[PDB]
Design an enzyme around this catalytic site. Structure first.
Site, PDB file in Angstrom:
ATOM      1  N   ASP B   1       0.805  -1.219   0.000  1.00  0.00           N
ATOM      2  CA  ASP B   1       0.000   0.000   0.000  1.00  0.00           C
ATOM      3  C   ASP B   1       0.853   1.290   0.000  1.00  0.00           C
ATOM      4  N   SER B  26       2.358   6.963   0.431  1.00  0.00           N
ATOM      5  CA  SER B  26       1.466   5.976   1.050  1.00  0.00           C
ATOM      6  C   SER B  26       0.051   6.131   0.512  1.00  0.00           C
ATOM      7  N   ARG B  27      -0.526   5.061  -0.052  1.00  0.00           N
ATOM      8  CA  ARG B  27      -1.847   5.113  -0.696  1.00  0.00           C
ATOM      9  C   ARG B  27      -3.011   4.794   0.229  1.00  0.00           C
ATOM     10  N   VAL B  28      -2.772   4.070   1.321  1.00  0.00           N
ATOM     11  CA  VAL B  28      -3.736   3.946   2.435  1.00  0.00           C
ATOM     12  C   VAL B  28      -3.620   5.102   3.419  1.00  0.00           C
ATOM     13  N   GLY B  29      -2.402   5.552   3.717  1.00  0.00           N
ATOM     14  CA  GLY B  29      -2.134   6.625   4.667  1.00  0.00           C
ATOM     15  C   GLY B  29      -2.890   7.922   4.360  1.00  0.00           C
TER      16      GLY B  29
END
Lengths: 117, 171, 114, 57, 49, 189, 50, 114
Positions: B1, B26-29
């Site tokens: 992620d 960060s793609r979830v963050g």
């Protein structure tokens, strides 16, 4: 007492002490001694300088479009181009004095005058 | 992620940790990041990426406009602000204040040779008095208006208390 | 042009000609930077870099990363904007004015923010 | 000599007034910078004394 | 010149007065930091023990 | 493909040598140029001193000291390179020149152009504004004989009033090896 | 994570996977050991959720 | 500065900086000669030349040829010697005084005998 500079649009060309220096101007031929008034004059189109001082025998010069500035303490001569009698060539000066372009004819005569003719 | 791409060129220049922004992400963050941190850092990623390009350009120019030069000097001080020594993990209540210093521009009076020391002394001062800032951030997760004004009232008292290794006192 | 109509197809070939010429200058750009190009190429690269950034958009899905809202640009306002760009109308606006922006009205606003 | 000295003293006193105003600013900021640097040196001495008790303990 | 010298005397008195305030604040500042590093020394000795 | 990449590493490895040579040649020439600047400086100071003394004595009614009755036109001399590879040097000169035009045309004067160098003569050959006279063969090694002709041509164009009401020069002012900028000066009146 | 750069720009949520990609001798291990060391401020509290 | 002392790390980073500047200036030195450099750059090159010489050592392999014994320099003496050398404290000595020498007391011995 006097110090002398000869200066060209691109160079501080020569400097020494002075006690006699002579120039020829649109007003006439003029000498300058170790005390003299403040003066500004324009040298003739075909103009030569002679520079002399208490330390040694004098020096002989050709000048293009020169200007002169004096005060009894310091003398400066300001030049478009200058050539020493040790560097002027008689065949080149004689050829230039024969030319049809007025500044080149004047510069030819200037170099001939520094060559004593 | 996501990735924290560590660049060996930045690591050898002494930027440690060597986080290469733009290619790091960060793609979830941003969902899980605490609200105070999200308020202070909300532009900091973009402000560092535009600094890296602006510097790689301006290092080979004679001069630049004052707004670009202010963005460059801010970016160079944010890079000196983000680096930290090994085995020194900061508590989040200290991280958000350390990023407040740089993002809000309070580092703009401090030279790049002193910035890391400036933050290091300020975060011990605020750990020794005015600790209701750190305690407030820990116990409510939010950099509230009454904690922000109480922080800016303390940063200015510390700036007059500080002296760079060369140049004057700060303001 | 038989399917999208002439005005779309003309613009979508002018934009591609420009970006193609910019990509075929990229080997010089990488070494020397912009100014060593000829003026007919430097004119082109200045609009190519604007067109390249103006193909960016603030998407509806981007909101979860950037926090900014998403924009929708109708086909007609898309064609018009690239027609004006390729004809050179915007070459006085800075490259940063074109990033992540929806349409001409929002380009004007962002240019006035700078 | 008195009338000449009156204008001489007036001009000298005015020049010293501008110089003394400058010296007021320069002494004020010099004392302020020296005192603030002394506060930084005192804190820094206490931080090093703090480090010295940390490693001593 | 009396105004200028009065301003010099005033500015020197102001500078010594606020210099006394800064140095008094630094006496607190040096205790304040020394207390936090003393607390760090006790916490580190506790970690070793 | 490896054959292509090997060729591109051979290409770039030649260019790195040829550009490193011309960085070192430019590092020679900035020293020679600074020597010629500091050698031309004492004359410029003494002609200024002499001109201050003459202006002290003069009625000052020389044409180059007085404004024209109508601001019909303005001369701009733009100074720029013959050689390429100079980087933003000509971009800076030509941007400052186009800013000077915006100010002049805001006052109501249309600029007329005099150009030194081949790069600006190319730029004003692409942008459709005319050049009245140009010079090219000397921008990296200018000699007084060249500046004599330029300053004659500029003074003739001012005194003609087909003539200008004022004239300006746009060039980069060298202030250090690390810092120069394009600057605009009014040379007359 | 207790690293200023990472908790500011690339925040690690619980149940994220976050790749510490890099070159050799670039502090990849030092970012992870700093991350594991930091958790002691939460381990001292006995609740299984912090 | 975790494994070696902060003083060792600082001295080694400064020796590297001085030698990195000189390895950049060696192109100017070779093409334009030393006179092309400023007073600050020749003041650096004077230190850099001496630093790269002072990294040379009379060593126990060279005992085979020179007959003079090889030398061991303690770490603390090495750090203190390059700290003083990078701060310029030996600039008045010629380069020949720093070649093949067994620490700071031995530098004094070669330099006074030269």
């Amino acid at each position: 007492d006097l110090n002398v500079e000869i200066v060209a649009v691109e160079r501080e060309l020569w400097s020494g002490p002075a006690t006699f220096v002579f120039t020829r101007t649109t007003a006439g031929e003029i000498g300058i001694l170790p005390r003299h008034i403040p003066l500004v004059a324009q040298l003739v189109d075909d103009a030569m300088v002679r520079v002399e001082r208490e330390g040694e025998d004098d020096l002989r010069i050709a000048v293009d479009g020169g200007f002169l500035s004096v005060t009894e303490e310091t003398v400066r001569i300001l030049v478009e181009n200058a050539q020493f009698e040790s560097e002027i060539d008689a065949d080149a000066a004689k050829e230039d004095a024969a030319s049809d372009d007025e500044r080149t004819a004047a510069w030819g005569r200037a170099r001939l005058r520094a060559l004593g003719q | 992620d996501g990735q924290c791409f560590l660049e060996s060129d930045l690591f050898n220049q002494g930027v440690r940790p060597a986080i290469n922004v733009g290619v790091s992400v960060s793609r979830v963050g941003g969902a899980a990041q605490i609200k105070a941190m999200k308020e202070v850092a909300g532009s900091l990623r973009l402000d560092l990426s535009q600094y890296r390009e602006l510097e790689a350009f301006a290092a080979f120019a004679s001069d630049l406009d004052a707004a670009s030069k202010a963005q460059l000097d801010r970016g160079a001080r944010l890079v000196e602000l983000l680096k930290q020594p090994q085995y020194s993990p900061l508590a989040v209540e200290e991280q958000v204040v350390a990023i407040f210093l740089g993002t809000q521009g309070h580092l703009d009076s401090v030279p790049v040779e002193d910035v890391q020391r400036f933050e290091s002394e300020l975060l011990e001062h605020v750990k020794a008095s005015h600790s209701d800032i750190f305690d407030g951030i820990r116990e409510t997760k939010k950099l509230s208006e009454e904690a922000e004004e109480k922080l800016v009232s303390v940063i200015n008292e510390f700036k007059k208390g500080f002296q760079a290794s060369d140049g004057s006192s700060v303001v | 042009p038989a399917i999208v109509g002439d005005e779309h197809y003309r613009v979508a070939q002018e934009v591609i000609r420009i970006l193609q010429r910019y990509k075929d200058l990229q080997d010089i750009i990488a070494i020397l930077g912009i100014d060593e190009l000829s003026e007919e190429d430097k004119q082109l690269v200045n609009r190519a870099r604007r067109i390249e950034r103006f193909l960016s958009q603030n998407m509806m899905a981007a909101e979860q990363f950037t926090g900014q809202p998403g924009s929708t640009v109708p086909l007609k306002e898309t064609i018009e904007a690239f027609d004006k760009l390729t004809k050179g109308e915007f070459d006085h606006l800075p490259e940063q004015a074109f990033f992540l922006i929806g349409g001409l009205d929002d380009l004007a606003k962002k240019a006035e923010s700078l | 000599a008195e009338r000449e000295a009156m204008l001489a003293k007036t001009a000298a006193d005015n020049r010293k007034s501008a110089e003394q105003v400058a010296a007021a600013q320069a002494d004020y900021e010099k004392e302020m910078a020296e005192a603030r640097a002394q506060a930084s040196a005192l804190r820094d001495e206490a931080r090093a004394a703090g480090r010295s008790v940390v490693d001593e303990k | 010149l009396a105004d200028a010298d009065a301003m010099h005397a005033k500015a020197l008195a102001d500078a010594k007065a606020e210099s006394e305030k800064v140095t008094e604040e630094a006496k607190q500042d040096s205790e304040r930091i020394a207390a936090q590093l003393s607390e760090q020394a006790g916490s580190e000795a506790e970690r070793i023990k | 493909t490896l054959r292509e990449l090997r060729g591109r590493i051979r290409s770039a490895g030649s260019i790195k040598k040829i550009t490193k040579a011309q960085e070192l040649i430019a590092t020679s020439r900035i020293a020679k140029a600074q020597a010629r600047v500091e050698a031309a400086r004492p004359y410029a100071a003494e002609i200024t001193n002499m001109l201050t003394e003459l202006a002290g004595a003069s009625a000052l009614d020389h044409p180059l000291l007085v404004e024209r009755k109508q601001p019909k036109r303005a001369g701009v001399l733009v100074v720029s390179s013959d050689r390429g590879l100079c980087g933003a040097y000509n971009a800076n000169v030509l941007r400052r020149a186009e800013e000077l035009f915006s100010l002049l045309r805001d006052e109501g004067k249309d600029p007329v152009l005099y150009v030194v160098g081949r790069k600006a003569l190319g730029y004003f050959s692409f942008r459709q504004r005319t050049v009245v006279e140009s010079w090219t063969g000397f921008s990296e090694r200018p000699t007084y004989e060249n500046a004599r002709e330029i300053a004659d041509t500029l003074v003739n164009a001012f005194m003609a009033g087909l003539g200008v009401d004022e004239l300006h020069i746009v060039f980069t002012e060298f202030r250090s090896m690390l810092s120069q900028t394009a600057v605009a000066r009014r040379a007359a009146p | 994570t207790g690293i200023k750069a990472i908790d500011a720009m690339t925040p690690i949520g619980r149940g994220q996977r976050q790749l510490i990609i890099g070159d050799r001798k670039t502090g990849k291990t030092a970012v992870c050991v700093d991350t594991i060391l930091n958790q002691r401020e939460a381990w001292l509290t006995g609740d299984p959720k912090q």
